[PDB]
Structure formats: structure tokens, C-alpha cells
Amino acid sequence: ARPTVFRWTGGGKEVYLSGSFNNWSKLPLTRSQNNFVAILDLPEGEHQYKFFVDGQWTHDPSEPIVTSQLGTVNNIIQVKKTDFEVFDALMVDSQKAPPILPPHLLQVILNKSCDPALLPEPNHVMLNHLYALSIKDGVMVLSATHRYKKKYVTTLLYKPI
Amino acid sequence: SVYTTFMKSHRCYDLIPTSSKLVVFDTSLQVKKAFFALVTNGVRAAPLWDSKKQSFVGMLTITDFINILHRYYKSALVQIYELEEHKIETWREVYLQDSFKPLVCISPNASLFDAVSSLIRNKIHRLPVIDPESGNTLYILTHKRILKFLKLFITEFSLEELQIGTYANIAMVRTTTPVYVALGIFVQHRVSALPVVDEKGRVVDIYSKFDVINLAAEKTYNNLDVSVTKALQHRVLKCYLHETLEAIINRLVEAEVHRLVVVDEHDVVKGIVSLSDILQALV
Amino acid sequence: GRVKIGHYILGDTLGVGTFGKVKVGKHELTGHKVAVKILNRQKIRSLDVVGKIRREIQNLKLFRHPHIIKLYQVISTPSDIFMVMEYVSGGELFDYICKNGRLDEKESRRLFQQILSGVDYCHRHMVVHRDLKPENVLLDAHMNAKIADFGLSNMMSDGEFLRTSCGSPNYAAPEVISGRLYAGPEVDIWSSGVILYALLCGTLPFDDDHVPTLFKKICDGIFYTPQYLNPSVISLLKHMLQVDPMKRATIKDIREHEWFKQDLPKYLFPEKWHLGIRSQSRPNDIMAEVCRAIKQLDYEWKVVNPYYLRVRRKNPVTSTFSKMSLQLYQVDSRTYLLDFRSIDDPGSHTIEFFEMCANLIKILAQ
Ligand SMILES: COc1nc(N(C)C)ccc1-c1cc2c(C(=O)O[C@@H]3O[C@H](C(=O)O)[C@@H](O)[C@H](O)[C@H]3O)c[nH]c2cc1Cl
Ligand SMILES: Nc1ncnc2c1ncn2[C@@H]1O[C@H](COP(=O)(O)OP(=O)(O)O)[C@@H](O)[C@H]1O
Ligand SMILES: Nc1ncnc2c1ncn2[C@@H]1O[C@H](COP(=O)(O)O)[C@@H](O)[C@H]1O
Ligand SMILES: Nc1ncnc2c1ncn2[C@@H]1O[C@H](COP(=O)(O)O)[C@@H](O)[C@H]1O
Ligand SMILES: [Cl-]
Ligand SMILES: [Cl-]
Ligand SMILES: [Cl-]
Ligand SMILES: [Cl-]
């Protein structure tokens, strides 16, 4: 049902994949370079598998194993629902001196006839940054440009100190 | 009902410009500094932020300046001591004593019809557009702007006959009328502009609430003894009753004025048609 | 015994991308050819790029431009992630320029318009494809440009800059080779300028075996203009290859340029303040001064870099949390300024931010 990648990372003249999912029949793996692969649809559940690398039976030591009552050592695979969906798989996967001032922040829209209510369109980079006027007569003037949806608003607050 | 439905559809956000400037005053700010800031920033109205209340309490406009000036003026020989040393809250406590008024505002998502009705319902010209999710004031909706967008849709898709506006008990001033007297009329009548009349009933000029900021700008507010004409020396569209409402709306936006004066065949005042009335009729 | 993903049979490796091999895929029934980028889940988490890939997939899935490689689907397996994309036969634009010489004015102009149309589409969608080179510009059967490696791309976020020096030194902007902060689009314009030079000349404007002299040449902005070059394009190359990002061309400046405008197809385009407070003290003294003042106001915080602070405040009225970011930058060889940035989440958020700043400014220098 869900596609599963089976990759053997080693050398070999002939490599086969035996598993519970194919009644332990020897399936041949195609080689690119030092990797032997096969992608196959698997029913979400528990599956045991082994490799037949050049006349010898083995498991991938880096992959999870299962030792049996009879001493058989096969690799094990738990096919999850989260493994099949991109963003579910990516969510589960995630578990000096000061910088020089960018010249962009020195480019104000307040300083740069027409309407005084209207201002030029700002560069995204200078949005949410606080700008201020020199405290003249014990009153501070603070300003910042913010965007509401597709429009921008430069609010300036006249606040005493 | 044709234009009425159009307003009930379009959101307030559609009228907010791409890049706007908003001036906000903290109530603790000295009121003289506040009016001078309106002038320097080129803004006609500015919302007020109460630091202790952590919310927008109201708005400072030119009416506030007209109210302080008339209420507290003594003469050109004495300073308007209060205007000089009074905070916005100190004055708003006096101005709105027992008669208290809360903040009237609109959401950007709310319709144009919701905003037009809210202007007439509360008897206001400046409406702040506040986003509820952020609590931030974005734009200040004016009659001039709403009637501008509706004029674009009117083009793409008589005055005596329809009878729109106030034509009786009109508040007017003479050429010689002092500024202080005019300010008093603006207070008692609660009107945006006073038409300047000659020796005879004929209209020569118009002194508006706007022309009062020139006193703040030129720092000439301490002398209100000067005539209305003397004050208007720092810088007149008339319509008749035999003109169509669509042509009256067209003439208004073509010059971008807040009202048209109804003059007779001999240039004498008969009534007034304001942007408040046009938008009331189209609701 | 054929390797299959989707219904496409995986074949020859086209190349090795930013985070994995890219192999051809030919459909079982139709014979339709696709390019498949193989991302090993365990390898992408090793060089912690799980977030980078998540974003890369998110962007490329909603893009649709005739000169940007389409990402058809992402097939996920327990072991690996398979990105199925559109295949182009023409291969690298670089190899084309190698085999055949420089492209003629008409040919170069056509291809440049197509490349820039895509670079624009990216920027319009707040995506800046760093590492823009002829090696990453693929050609189809009909000689159409196709932008392809979005491995080193990044998002353009309101109020933030990028630091990562990404592309090939020859195509990298001076600020990128200087490891300085950038907005994003300007560094793509520089790269596009180099691509334009490569198209017209068949060589690189900035190239030297001696790496230090190459880096000097880039930062000096001096490059050779062969005699065959039309002064109007020399004009455009001069505007695009400006060492000063503020003096450098924008897509609009290019769109308006007379050389670019020529034969341009319709289908391509759809038409007394101061920053913060500056203190001449030692950088760490400023950091001690701010921290002692932030706690004095009873504000919470988290120290990111030794010059980056993520501060929070509890509103005594609205009972809402208001957060801002503080960053110290170096202005002169003598002065340093502290920058205040509001971070997006009752009363006004914007005004609450001003009051937060104002308080700290009152207890500080210039
Ligand atoms: C034999 O494999 C294949 N053959 C195919 N054909 C056409 C016969 C088709 C697809 C694959 C394939 C390859 C890989 C893969 C891979 O090649 O990884 C590399 O492994 C190398 C190594 O371990 O030596 C490192 O050097 C190096 O960086 C690293 O990309 C990772 N996950 C994969 C999943 C599949 Cl389905
Ligand atoms: N949103 C508001 N809430 C409460 N009062 C307001 C609001 N906006 C303005 N005011 C008040 O309305 C009165 C009249 O103002 P206004 O009509 O806006 O004057 P102007 O003609 O200069 O635009 C003033 O006293 C002002 O304080
Ligand atoms: N000079 C005036 N005299 C009487 N009413 C007026 C005058 N000017 C405006 N009005 C009325 O006041 C209301 C609000 O208009 P306005 O304040 O001019 O925007 C409307 O009903 C107008 O008709
Ligand atoms: N009916 C009118 N005709 C001509 N100018 C007018 C009229 N009403 C107001 N004004 C002018 O409009 C300005 C006042 O602005 P406002 O109150 O915004 O309309 C002044 O310059 C007045 O002279
Ligand atoms: Cl490669
Ligand atoms: Cl083939
Ligand atoms: Cl093709
Ligand atoms: Cl080349």
C-alpha cells in the first residue's frame, strides 16, 4: 500500500531481498554504485526481512533487528501512517562582534503639492522597526511602519516624558 | 436603493490607501503641542491613547481647538493661559463633564453602509478604522473619501425637486464679524462652515472649521478680535436649485470641497447642501 | 528489476543538487519524463535542514511560472522523501554557453527576460533564490529558461534580514562575499547581472584563479566590457552590478530599462527621524545597560545572540503579552545603535510597542 525503500550499502555481484512480505522469495536489487535498491509497496504493519549478498545471508546492522527463539537474526520494519505523508514525516523528523548596520534601515519613508496622509510603499525589511525624533520640549515622538493585509500604516505616537 | 446596496457590500478596508500616515496623541500631552502637531503633520484628526486605560478614548479635531478658543478667550492683551498649559485629558474632563461620550469606530471588514450610517447616527465627520484582532487604528474615514469612491461607480454605472440638505435657520456671518463671534456660532449651531455675507444678503466668501487651523499654524490664535475676512486673507463655489443632483455631486468632487452653498439668481444665500446630507439620502 | 516511485521508473542521475541526487523518471505507461530529487530523511536531519526542506516544498508546491521548474508531487517513504518535478531535455544553460559560444544580443535578451521574469515571480512570492547561476538555469527543448535549485533559497519576512553567504563566489554579491546582512532581492539582481554578462560574453565578469583578487574584483565592482557589447546593455550591467545595494537596480529599474523593454513579450509580466538609539559605549557595556533596564521594568526575555534579545511584557490592563526584539548594530568605527523590532502575536499592539520602547529609551544614551 505505502512505498518502502530497501537499500543495501555495500559492494556485490548479486544482492537479493528476502522478506515476510514476499514469502521469503529472493528479489534482486538494482545497483547504482555502492548501493543496491528496491522500492516496493508494503501493508502498514510489521515485516521481517534479510539480505542475500553474494552467497551470504545478512541483515543491515544499522537497521533494527529481531533475534528469534530459534536464533534467527532478521531486520524488522514498522511501517507507520506518518511515514507516507510528507509534512507528517517532516514533523516527526524534527525529533563575536555586533553586525554592521544594513543601509536599508536608514531609508525612511517619513522624510522621502501631494497628500500629507500618503507615504511611499516601504521595503518589507524596514517594517516593525522603531524610528524616533529627538526629544524636543520634553515630548518623545516615536514612529513605526506596519502592514495590515495588503496595505501599510505608519503610526506616530506623540508621548510626553 | 441602487447605490444603497453597493455600500452594504464593499468592506471599509477597500478604501484604506496602500501607504498611510497615522498621528496618535497620548492624553497626557499638552493640548497646544497637540494642535501644533496636527498642523506640522498635515493631519486634520488624531486618535487619543489613554496610557492608564490602555485603549483609544477619543479623537482630537479642529472642533476641539474652536471649543478651547471660544470657551477660554479673554482678549488679545491676555494669554489663553489654559490652552498654553492644559493636557488633552484635563481639557476633555471639562469639555465632556456630565455629558460623557465614548469612542465611535468601525472594523475594516465592516461594510461602507455600516460606516456611512455610523457617521450620521453619531453626528460625526471623522471615523477611525480599527482592526479588532490587533486593536490598531489603521485609517480615518472621511465623507470626502467615501463620496470619492461612490463617484467613480456613479460615472461607470434637480436640487429643488429632490430637496437635499438644510435650507432653513442657516448659521452665517458678515464680512466684519470677528473670529471670536464666528467661533461661538460654530459652537452653538454645530456646523462645519459659515458663509460670509455682504452689506446685502449676497454671499462673498466662506469661513470654515478648517480655516481655524491657520490660527494654530501662523500662531495668530491670541487675536480673535480680527474680522472673518481678515482671517481669510491667508489665501467661492456656488450652486443653484435648477441644477441636477448628479451634476451637484459631480461639481463637489471636481473641486474636492465638503459642501455647496445654495445661492439664488441674485447671488444671495438660500440654503446649504453638505456631504453629510448626500450620503444620508443615499442610505 | 526496475526501480519505481509513483509510476515513473527511476533511471540515470541528472546531477547532485543542494541536498540530494536528482534522477530521471520515465512513466511506466506514458513515457512522461520527470526529475526526482531524493532526500534521505536521516541525512536531512543530520545537517539540520528539516525546516529548510519543509519551506522549500511549501513554496514550490504553490508556484506556477513558465520559467521556474514545477514540483509536481512529493512522495514520502519511511527512509526517503522524493520530489517529483518537471524534466527539461536541454540541460544546463552553462553547458549551452560552453558548447556554443556567447549568445547574440537578441538571443541573450530573450533568455534574460525569461530568467528575470522568474526571479521576479519568486520575489513577488517573498522567496529569494540565492545561488542563481547558469548551472542552475536549465533549458527546455524550445530553449526556454527554467530556474531550478531552490535548496539555498529563503523567505523574505517583514522586518528581517538574511546572513547566510550562499552561492558560487563568481555569482555572489559583494555583501554576500563580505558576509554582511542583506534584504534578499538585491543579491538575486547581482546574480542575474552576472548571468546577463555570461549570456552576452560567454565568460564571467568577475573571475580569477587567485581567490583574494577575485573577491577584490567583486567588491571593487570593476569588470571588463568587450567592444561588441552594446552601450545600452553596458548601462544595464553597470546598474545591476553596483557594489552599493542602495545604488543597485531593482526589477522595476530593469523593467524600465530600454534594452530590457525591447521585444519583451506580454506574457512575462502581469502589468529629522532616527532609527533606534545610538550609544558610543563598548558593545558589551550596552548589553549590560539594556539587561539591567529591561529587568528594572520587570520584562521577561531570552538571550539569542550576544547582541540579540527577545523581550516580553505582561500588560497590567489588557492582561495580554506584548513582545519585541532588540538588536545591536555597528554604525561607525566609533558608534553602535540599538534597534527595536515588534514581533507579531484588547488595546493597540502598535501603541503598546511604542510605550515598551519609550520606557527603555528614557533610561539610555542618545
Ligand atoms: C541504488 O539506489 C538507487 N538507485 C536507483 N537506480 C536508478 C538504480 C534509483 C534510486 C536509488 C536511491 C538512492 C538513494 C540514496 C543515495 O544514493 O545516497 C547516497 O549514498 C552515498 C553512500 O552512502 O555512499 C552517499 O555518498 C551520497 O552522499 C548519498 O546521496 C539515498 N537514498 C536513496 C534512495 C534511492 Cl531509491
Ligand atoms: N471617534 C470619536 N469618538 C468620540 N468623539 C469623537 C470621535 N471623533 C471625533 N469626536 C468628537 O466629535 C466632535 C466633533 O468633531 P468633528 O466632526 O470630527 O470635527 P471636524 O469638522 O474638524 O472634522 C469633537 O468634539 C471630537 O472630540
Ligand atoms: N451654515 C449652516 N447653517 C445651517 N445648517 C448647516 C450649515 N452648514 C451645514 N449645515 C448642516 O449641518 C449638517 C452637517 O453638515 P456639515 O457639518 O457641514 O458637514 C447638515 O445637515 C447640513 O445641512
Ligand atoms: N461652498 C464652498 N465654496 C468654495 N470654497 C469652499 C466652500 N466651502 C468651503 N470652501 C473652502 O474649503 C476650505 C475649508 O475646507 P473644508 O471644511 O475641508 O471644506 C476653505 O479653503 C474654504 O474656502
Ligand atoms: Cl551537479
Ligand atoms: Cl529514454
Ligand atoms: Cl523538453
Ligand atoms: Cl560561462
Compose a concise summary of this entry.
Chain B has helices at residues 2-9, 31-41, 62-72, 81-84, 88-95, 112-121, 143-156, 159-162, 179-189, 213-217, 228-231, 245-255, 275-281; strands at residues 19-26, 46-50, 55-60, 126-130, 137-142, 173-174, 193-197, 203-208, 238-239, 259-263, 269-274. Chain B has 283 residues and is of the alpha/beta class.
How would you describe the shape of chain B?
flat
Number of domains of chain B: 1
- Number of helical regions of chain A: 1
Q: List SSEs of chain B in N-to-C order.
A: HEHEEHHHHEEHHEHEEHHEHEEH
Q: Hey, roughly how much beta strand do the residues of chain B contain?
A: 15-25%
Compute the number of structural domains of chain A.
2
What is the number of helical segments of chain B per DSSP (H or I, 4+ residues)?
Answer: 13
Radius of gyration of chain B: 20 Å
* Largest inter-chain contact set: A-C, 62 and 70 residues
Structural class of chain B: alpha/beta
Order of adjacent strands in the largest pleated sheet of chain B: 1-2-3
Oligomer: heterotrimer
How many beta strands in the DSSP annotation of chain A? 12
- What is the gyration radius of chain A calculated from CA atoms? 32 Å
Modified residues (Phosphothreonine) (chain C): 13, 164, 250
Binding site for ATP (chain C): 14-22, 37
Cofactor (chain C): Mg(2+)
InterPro entries (chain C): AMPK_C, AMPKA1_C, KA1/Ssp2_C, Kinase-like_dom_sf, PRKAA1/2_AID, PRKAA1_UBA, Prot_kinase_dom, Protein_kinase_ATP_BS
